[PDB]
Amino acid sequence: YPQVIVDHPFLYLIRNRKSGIILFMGRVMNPHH
Amino acid sequence: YPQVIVDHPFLYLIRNRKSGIILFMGRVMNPHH
Amino acid sequence: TITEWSVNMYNHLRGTGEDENILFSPLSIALAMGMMELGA
Amino acid sequence: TITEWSVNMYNHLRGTGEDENILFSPLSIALAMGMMELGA
Amino acid sequence: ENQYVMKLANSLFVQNGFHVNEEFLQMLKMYFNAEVNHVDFSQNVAVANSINKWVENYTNSLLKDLVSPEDFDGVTNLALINAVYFKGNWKSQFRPENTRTFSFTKDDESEVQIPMMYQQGEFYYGEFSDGSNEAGGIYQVLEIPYEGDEISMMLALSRQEVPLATLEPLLKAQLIEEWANSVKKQKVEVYLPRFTVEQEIDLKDILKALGVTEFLSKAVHKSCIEVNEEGSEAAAASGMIAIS
Amino acid sequence: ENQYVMKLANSLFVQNGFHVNEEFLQMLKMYFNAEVNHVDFSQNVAVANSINKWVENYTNSLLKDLVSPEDFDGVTNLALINAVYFKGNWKSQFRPENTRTFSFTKDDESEVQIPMMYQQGEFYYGEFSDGSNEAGGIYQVLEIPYEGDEISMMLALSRQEVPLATLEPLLKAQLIEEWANSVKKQKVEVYLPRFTVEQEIDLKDILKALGVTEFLSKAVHKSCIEVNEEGSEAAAASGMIAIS
Numbered sequence: 001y002p003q004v005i006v007d008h009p010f011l012y013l014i015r016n017r018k019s020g021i022i023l024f025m026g027r028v029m030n031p032h033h
Numbered sequence: 034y035p036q037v038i039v040d041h042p043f044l045y046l047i048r049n050r051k052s053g054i055i056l057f058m059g060r061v062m063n064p065h066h
Numbered sequence: 067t068i069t070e071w072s073v074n075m076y077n078h079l080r081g082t083g084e085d086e087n088i089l090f091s092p093l094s095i096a097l098a099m100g101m102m103e104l105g106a
Numbered sequence: 107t108i109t110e111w112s113v114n115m116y117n118h119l120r121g122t123g124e125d126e127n128i129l130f131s132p133l134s135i136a137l138a139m140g141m142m143e144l145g146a
Numbered sequence: 147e148n149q150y151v152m153k154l155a156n157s158l159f160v161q162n163g164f165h166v167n168e169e170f171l172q173m174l175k176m177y178f179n180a181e182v183n184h185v186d187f188s189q190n191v192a193v194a195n196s197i198n199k200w201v202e203n204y205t206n207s208l209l210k211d212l213v214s215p216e217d218f219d220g221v222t223n224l225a226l227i228n229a230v231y232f233k234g235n236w237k238s239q240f241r242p243e244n245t246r247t248f249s250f251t252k253d254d255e256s257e258v259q260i261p262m263m264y265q266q267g268e269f270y271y272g273e274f275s276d277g278s279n280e281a282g283g284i285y286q287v288l289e290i291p292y293e294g295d296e297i298s299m300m301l302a303l304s305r306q307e308v309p310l311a312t313l314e315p316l317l318k319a320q321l322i323e324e325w326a327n328s329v330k331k332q333k334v335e336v337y338l339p340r341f342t343v344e345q346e347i348d349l350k351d352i353l354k355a356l357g358v359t360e361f362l363s364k365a366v367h368k369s370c371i372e373v374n375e376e377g378s379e380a381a382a383a384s385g386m387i388a389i390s
Numbered sequence: 391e392n393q394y395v396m397k398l399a400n401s402l403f404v405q406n407g408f409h410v411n412e413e414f415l416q417m418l419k420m421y422f423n424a425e426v427n428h429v430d431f432s433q434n435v436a437v438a439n440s441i442n443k444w445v446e447n448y449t450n451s452l453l454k455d456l457v458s459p460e461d462f463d464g465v466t467n468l469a470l471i472n473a474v475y476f477k478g479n480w481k482s483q484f485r486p487e488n489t490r491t492f493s494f495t496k497d498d499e500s501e502v503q504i505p506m507m508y509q510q511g512e513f514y515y516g517e518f519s520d521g522s523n524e525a526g527g528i529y530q531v532l533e534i535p536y537e538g539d540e541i542s543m544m545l546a547l548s549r550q551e552v553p554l555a556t557l558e559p560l561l562k563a564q565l566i567e568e569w570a571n572s573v574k575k576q577k578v579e580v581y582l583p584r585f586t587v588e589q590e591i592d593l594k595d596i597l598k599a600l601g602v603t604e605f606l607s608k609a610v611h612k613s614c615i616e617v618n619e620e621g622s623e624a625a626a627a628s629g630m631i632a633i634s
Contacts, residue, residue: 001577001578001579002515002530002578002579003581004532004545004579004581006532006545006583007493007494007495007506007583008495008497008547008550009553010545010547010548011116011554011557011558012543012545012546013546014541014542014543014615014622014624016540016541017540017541017542017570018181018540019175020175021108021175021176022109023131023132023133023541023624024130024613024615024624025116025129025130025132026119026127026129026130026589027127027128027558028585029126029496031502031583032504033585033587034334035334035335037271037336037337038337039288039337039338040248041252041253041303041304043303043304044076044310044314044317045300046302047232047298047299047380048297048298048300049297049298050291050296050297050298050326051296051425052425053069053326053416054092054093055068055093056092056152056230056232056380057090057091057369057382058076058089058091058092059076059343059345060080060088060314061087061341061343062085062087062254063087063252063258064250064258064339065258065341066341066342067413068319068415069319070319070320073317074356075352077314078352078355078356079352080311085252085253087343087345089343089344089345090382091230091367091369091384093230093420094229094230094367094369094384095228095349095384097154097156097178097228097230097384097421098227098384098386099353099386100420100421101156101226101228101386104170104173104174104177105170105173106224108171108172108176108563109566110562110563110564113561113562113566115591115596117561118599119589119596120555125497128591129587129588129613129615130589130626131626131628133176133626134472134473134613134626134627135472135593136172136176137176137398137400137474137628138470138629138630139597139602139630140177141400141418142470142606144414144417144421145414146468146632
């Protein structure tokens, strides 16, 4: 069972597969809010 | 009361107002089908 | 040239002679030539 | 230059120094420059 | 604009091993929201079904035969396709109970029995002067909007004793603007017929016989509409078959 | 693709008396499905509300303040605006009952208490090698798709003892392609946090500091997303304010 606890900084990509266009992109330094 | 009996040949426009782009266009010579 | 353009095809499809129905979609053809003119 | 392009802005918004969150929409900016490059 | 249905969509078909400007794919992908699908244009029949099953899928199956095995060939690498599909409801729909046979007389002086739709409603109405003003040289115009106050159907109608061809030469872009800058909403009594027609133009040449000189090894347009009591359901699709 | 929500839309704002290439309006109108609205850019506050009320309308009100009275001025004739709005549901959503506070440790070695989402699900998982392979120099990657099998959220994650900045320089377009050419769907146990963040970039300069040299008197980008148990709701909007 791979375990992936994103309890610390990461970058992301809300993107579409079939086409490969990126909708939203960025990184999360502070998860607070 | 204007009376408009389209009982004979006419041309038409399925078009959008606000924008003015034409979707479908043509004329009806034979209404049969 | 939006509508004046589509009022030319209409003016073409009736020059054939056959007083028959004619129906097209300017929006669709205009969209095909658009891609078509994206790099070809 | 789709994704390599958007992986450059991302590479810009973090060169400022401030290790703070950053969020953009390549699709939206790419769409604005598109119109923008339609005649201006 | 969510009161009716305009669903629109593009795509691209290209030989599998064939590569093309990547800074054109997203280009399409983003701007034209294209669906870049890889096929094998060598398989004539196989690719037609493909594309047909596509357009026959984004137009609710009103256009079953868009491209044909004949539109393809061995050099076909690409194939641009678009499919427009309209579906709305008369803001003020006819009653299927006021529909009675009437005799549509084609400009051909021929006759055609037909189902006639009737209703007294609020429509954008307008009369305009024509070449000869004998019997008040004025042809009518009716604009019937669909549910979403966004789409309308404009009729350019003449007198029975006068062809639609004596009114066609007047047609111009600014004649259509004057259409919607004068059609005042009144209480007109319309008599439109229930009808469904589908044409099948052949672009390529009309494009050339229209301007575009910049090469496709074919082009195919097709579309049908089905007017009637409830509203209207139309669709179209265009196919640009490239040779390189 | 009707299993989620991607609703997209463009528009144009221009001085009322100001005229511009007509063979550019339909251009927009057709290709970018733009909404050509006439305003009075002299009325600083009045035009901002306008545009704000627009973007604040095509993004479900997640972006209330796009353009400002300050972005305008007396020479503002045009103003291009786009608004992207995403809204989907995790194909396999978290349980709000497995959400427990956890301590997110920023690369800053700082601490932040936070609501942690938990679930054991089928996700596209992938580990990749990095500069230093001491403790198996491999950072993780998780791809969670939304309901319509069309959109996904890709995570590029490192080890707590290593910053996200030691992984940022590796980022490249072909690194993202290798993301989705290796992420095999397994049975991973994820721990993502509930979070909502909104940034406000300032284009103009980044465009220049990126390439575009061809003039706008400003540019404004803004966007927010709200991750959580159910799914995700994000939106954006960009404003190209032209001076001529």
